[PDB]
Design a protein around this ligand. Structure first.
Ligand SMILES: COc1ccc2c(n1)[C@@H](C(=O)N1CCC[C@H](C(N)=O)C1)CC2
Ligand SMILES: [Zn+2]
Length: 139
């Protein structure tokens, strides 16, 4: 579990979104596993605007932060789940690191701020849904 709070927005994994997220829906993309809902309170999260390939992510299954090298956002095939059929997930970045179901929502950060959130994983690989291109989060 986990979300990004920037300005009047809440950024969560689409497959973990609540009824309130859908009642106050701003944008969603099933192909990215992203959903953005509106909030009343202000958000204090700086979103990175960069091409960084190194960062730090929070892994709640270990209650630890791990430094990682990660790939550029791309189309990667993701196996079937109770939320999605077998499809290519866009804007996804992989890293070598620990992840298990329950880690989705862990923020990935670089020196510039929030890069993305855990979305996939398995076999020593962790996948992150990129958010740096959503310039409308900051404006
Ligand atoms: C987060 O780490 C892991 C590790 C192992 C495993 C997972 N997640 C789970 C996972 O990746 N997905 C299920 C929920 C939706 C996901 C998506 N973005 O399409 C895919 C399946 C096993
Ligand atoms: Zn950055």
């Amino acid at each position: 579990s986990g979300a990004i709070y920037v300005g009047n927005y809440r950024v969560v994994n689409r497959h973990l979104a609540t009824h309130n997220d859908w009642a106050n829906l701003v944008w969603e993309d099933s192909s990215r596993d992203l959903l953005v809902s509106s909030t009343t309170a202000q958000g204090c999260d700086t979103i990175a605007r960069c091409d960084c390939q190194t960062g730090v992510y929070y892994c709640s299954s270990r209650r630890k932060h791990y430094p990682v090298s990660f790939s550029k956002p791309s189309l990667i095939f993701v196996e079937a789940s109770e939320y999605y059929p077998a499809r290519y997930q866009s804007h996804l970045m992989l890293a070598v690191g620990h992840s298990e179901p329950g880690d989705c929502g862990g923020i990935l950060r670089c020196q510039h701020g929030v890069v993305g959130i855990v979305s996939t994983g398995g076999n020593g690989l962790v996948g992150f849904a990129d958010v740096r291109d959503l310039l409308w989060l900051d404006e």
